[PDB]
Each structure stands twice: as C-alpha cells, then as structure tokens.
C-alpha cells in the first residue's frame, strides 16, 4: 500500500494524521 493509496482510502506526519482519521473510525 503506497502513501498515495492511504490518502485515497482514508480520504485525506501521516502516522499521526492515520491515528486521528483511527479516532474519527472509532467515532
């Protein structure tokens, strides 16, 4: 999985901004 694919999949520090869009996931 590329960083560009993570942007597309999550609709976007990538790890930090991963964790926050994770939290927004847990609602």
Which positions touch a second copy (CB under 8 A)?
1, 3, 6, 9-11, 13-23, 25-26
As measured in angstroms, the least distance from the Cβ of 12 to a second copy is 10
CB 14 within 8 A of CB 6: yes
Who's near 11: CB < 8 A, 6+ residues apart?
21
Closest separation in Å from C-beta 15 to a second copy:
2
The alpha-helical segments, DSSP class H, found in 1-27 are: 3-10, 14-26
How far apart are CB 7 and a second copy at their closest, in Å?
9
């Amino acid at each position: 999985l590329s960083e560009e694919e993570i942007q597309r999949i999550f609709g976007l520090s990538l790890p930090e901004e991963x964790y926050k869009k994770x939290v927004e996931x847990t609602g």
